[PDB]
């Protein structure tokens, strides 16, 4: 509940902790990972997973 990111591409799952999205999907940042571009956000479904920023855009 803060920053919202939008998926540009349809990147599948790469890590058990990572969560796939569909271009146009919005995700909310919940926490940041050891890496920058790499950020952990949740879905509107209440799902929690990490997503590559290089695959999405942060409106914030």
């Amino acid at each position: 509940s803060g920053t919202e990111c939008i998926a540009k591409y349809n990147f599948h799952g790469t890590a058990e902790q990572d969560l796939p999205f569909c271009k146009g999907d919005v995700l909310t940042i919940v926490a940041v990972t050891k890496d920058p571009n790499w950020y952990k956000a949740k879905n509107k479904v209440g799902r929690e997973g990490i997503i590559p920023a290089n695959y999405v855009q942060k409106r914030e």
Binding site: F11, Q17, D18, T33, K34, W38, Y55
Partner: peptide
């Protein structure tokens, strides 16, 4: 080949207490 996402570090399991 396009630019692949960032390296998948396991440290992700830890959240920095910014």
């Amino acid at each position: 080949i396009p630019p692949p996402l960032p390296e998948r570090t396991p440290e992700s399991f830890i959240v920095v207490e910014e």
